[PDB]
């Protein structure tokens, strides 16, 4: 009893010193002396949980709660452990019991809110976070988590004050040497200084170091040449998103496009096989594919990478879901680079480079990044659209009356043959146009009746809203559609006689300043609508209320459901102009709208995430779409919506250049990527530490 107290005390001490294993041994000794020690079980459990020994931690949490039925803190922490074991129902049960035992337990309410948040139930998450803050006004984790929920649904109540408080919270936590309550990925959304944003990321980098230092592994011996690999550079791509995810939608063709004479490609998957064609392709085309999801230990996984003799290890996650940055903290490779999947600095000394470009990351702002800049010659962004959606390379329209390029649209691999079977097809200078005859009436009839598909002259004509019922793999982008697809403004309730401005981003990317800008544009172009997505639906009423407050009637903004991947890209053809979000641009989303031939207006900011769209447009060759300030953004968007000849010119420009520019040219991109890798390697091989590669 008394002896057990001192043993538990000593363990706490050794724990603080960082001697985790001595702490464990001492906790166990305390239990050996006095088995019914609730605090000792809870302490050991917390330590085991920190080491990642979750099943073992669970044992001791269960002991603590039996010995002490009012031990709310233990139920709460046990819930945290179950959450990490991916037992969500279990975690919720624990948090629920914790709150029942002690209704004033602030942490338990916040923990419950996080379950609701991760489950997609934002309104319930908000309710629980507010309860936590009502119980404990000074609660940074809960305030910041609440702020992000509010962002997600476009609740901008007390917005300016909220932003000020977030910055204030971060400044205080950075001073007091604690992990900031704002996630580095979310830090792009708040008016934090570049210094603070880098500092937040650096804290996360140091977490990874802390976790691998306990492995006490020595620094790895790295290769000094390419002799053992027969002159080939061994490149390792590490991603949790080899499968159905935007990352693969952008880069799935790259591994197979590497030059085998000079490169040996290893893909390290952090996720299990999800059964999709995206995963199939990377596994089939990489020289080697290693499933690290089967190797939980970061030490063993890093050993595996080093065994392969990787020269350049590529971090495609940064601080995103499924990341295992501990692998990079262990430095199994001599050169480690951030690429594509994370729009910000890692802030981590174990990352050498970030692959970016001069437009996204001008050399003047290198101080925002901990990594050295490594420039691709055009943009660092890329997309697999030419391979995934080749049916959108060409289009035809149906004249249902002047001639419109975006009211009624057909696309298909066999579109040419179908057109060739029709009489009276006209070519507009090149866009094929079908007149308002029997063929065209039959198509519009299909759409109105909600019919799935029809047949004309033996050709399969599909309703664009019904792709999942015809071919689900084609709907998700896993397969190219094998039918001719119809897409119409009437499918989405869009006006036939007006300008359509679109933005297909998640609503969290919008802020008050942005919506006001959009309202200014709509007011200046009376014959126009703004087209947004229910992303999520619960954001819709907030946007509508704010628009109504700005003087816009409900009919000026049209919402559509989120669509399967192929339909989302295809329906971009119906818009006239995309209005990009300046706070955080469309990234994947930007590539999607440009592939449909839609001009995108953007205003690059200072953060990487706010500059991507401008980089894409610069590569594309449309400098006139890039605004230097809010007034110019409005003037550009209004010009496109009112000067109809100008609109035609720019749309024609986007339509042509998505093919002729490097933007969607995955072979060119890979070759430029290879050139950059070799610059990195030669620099290292000659005995130099990383330096900016900006020429």
């Amino acid at each position: 009893p008394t002896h057990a107290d001192s043993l538990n005390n000593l363990a706490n001490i050794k724990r603080e010193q960082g001697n985790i294993e001595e702490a464990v041994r001492l906790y166990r000794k305390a239990l050996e002396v006095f088995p019914e020690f609730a605090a000792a079980h809870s302490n050991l459990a917390s330590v085991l949980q920190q080491q990642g020994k979750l099943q073992e931690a669970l044992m001791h949490y269960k002991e603590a709660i039996r010995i002490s039925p009012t031990f709310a803190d233990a139920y709460s922490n046990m819930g945290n452990t179950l959450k990490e074991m991916q037992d969500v129902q279990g975690a919720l049960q624990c948090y629920t019991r914790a709150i029942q035992i002690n209704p004033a337990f602030a942490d338990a309410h916040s923990n419950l809110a996080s379950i609701h948040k991760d489950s997609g139930n934002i309104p319930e998450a908000i309710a629980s976070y507010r309860t936590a803050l009502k119980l404990k006004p000074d609660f940074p984790d809960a305030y910041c988590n609440l702020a992000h929920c509010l962002q997600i649904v476009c609740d901008w109540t007390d917005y300016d004050e909220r932003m000020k408080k977030l910055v204030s919270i971060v400044a205080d936590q950075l001073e007091k040497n604690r992990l900031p309550s704002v996630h580095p990925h979310h830090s792009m959304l708040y008016p934090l200084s570049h210094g603070f944003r880098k500092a937040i990321a650096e804290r996360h980098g140091n977490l990874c170091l802390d976790k691998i230092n306990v492995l006490h592994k020595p620094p790895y011996e790295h290769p000094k040449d390419l002799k053992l690999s027969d002159g080939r550079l061994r490149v390792g791509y590490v991603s949790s998103d080899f499968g159905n995810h935007p990352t693969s939608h952008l880069m799935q063709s790259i591994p197979g496009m590497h030059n085998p004479d000079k490169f040996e490609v290893f893909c390290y998957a952090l996720s299990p096989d999800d059964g999709t064609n995206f995963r199939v392709k990377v596994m089939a085309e990489a020289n080697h594919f290693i499933d690290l999801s089967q190797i939980p230990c970061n030490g063993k996984a890093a050993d595996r990478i080093h065994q392969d003799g990787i020269h350049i290890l590529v971090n495609m996650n940064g601080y995103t879901k499924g990341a295992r940055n501990e692998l990079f903290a262990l430095r199994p490779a001599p050169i480690q680079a951030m690429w594509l999947g994370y729009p910000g600095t890692s802030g981590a000394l174990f990352m050498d480079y970030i692959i970016t470009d001069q437009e996204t990351s001008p050399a003047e702002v290198a101080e925002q990044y901990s990594e050295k800049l490594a420039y691709m010659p055009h943009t660092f962004f890329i997309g697999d659209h030419a391979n995934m959606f080749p049916h959108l390379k060409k289009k035809a329209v149906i004249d249902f009356k002047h001639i419109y390029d975006n009211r009624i649209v057909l696309n298909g691999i066999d579109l040419k043959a179908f057109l060739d079977s029709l009489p009276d097809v006209k070519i507009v200078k090149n866009m094929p146009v079908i007149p308002m005859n029997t063929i065209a009436e039959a198509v519009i009839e299909m759409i109105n009746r909600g019919q799935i598909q029809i047949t004309i002259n033996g050709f399969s004509i599909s309703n664009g809203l019904a792709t999942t019922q015809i071919n689900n793999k084609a709907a998700t982008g896993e397969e190219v559609p094998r039918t001719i697809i119809v897409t119409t403004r009437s499918q989405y309730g869009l006006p036939e006689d007006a300008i359509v401005y679109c933005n297909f981003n998640q609503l969290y990317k919008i802020d008050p300043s942005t919506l006001q800008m959009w309202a200014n544009i709509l007011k200046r172009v009376p014959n126009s609508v703004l087209w947004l997505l229910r992303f999520p639906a619960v954001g819709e009423p907030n946007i509508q209320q704010y628009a109504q407050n700005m003087g816009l009637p409900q009919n000026r903004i049209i919402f559509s459901p989120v669509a399967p991947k192929e339909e989302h890209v295809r329906r971009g053809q119906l818009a006239d102009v995309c209005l990009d979000t300046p706070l955080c641009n469309g990234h994947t989303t930007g590539m999607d709208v440009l592939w449909a031939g839609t001009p995108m207006v953007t205003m690059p900011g200072e953060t990487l995430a706010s500059r991507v769209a401008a980089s894409q447009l610069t590569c594309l060759g449309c400098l006139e779409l890039i605004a230097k300030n809010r007034q110019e953004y409005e003037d550009i968007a209004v010009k496109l919506g009112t000067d109809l000849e100008y609109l035609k010119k720019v749309r024609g420009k986007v339509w042509k250049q998505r093919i002729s520019s490097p933007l969607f040219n995955t072979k060119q991109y890979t070759m430029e990527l290879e050139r950059l890798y070799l610059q990195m390697w030669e620099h290292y091989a000659a005995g130099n530490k990383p330096d900016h590669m900006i020429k």
Binding site: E84, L179, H183, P184, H185, H186, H204, D241, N244, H245, P246, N317, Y319, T320, K321, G322, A323, G341, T468, T476, Q506, P561, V562, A563, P564, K565, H587, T588
Partner: peptide, 14 residues
Amino acid sequence: YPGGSTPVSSANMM
């Protein structure tokens, strides 16, 4: 999307 799933870029747990 409703009836399916639309994966997005998401933060890791902390």
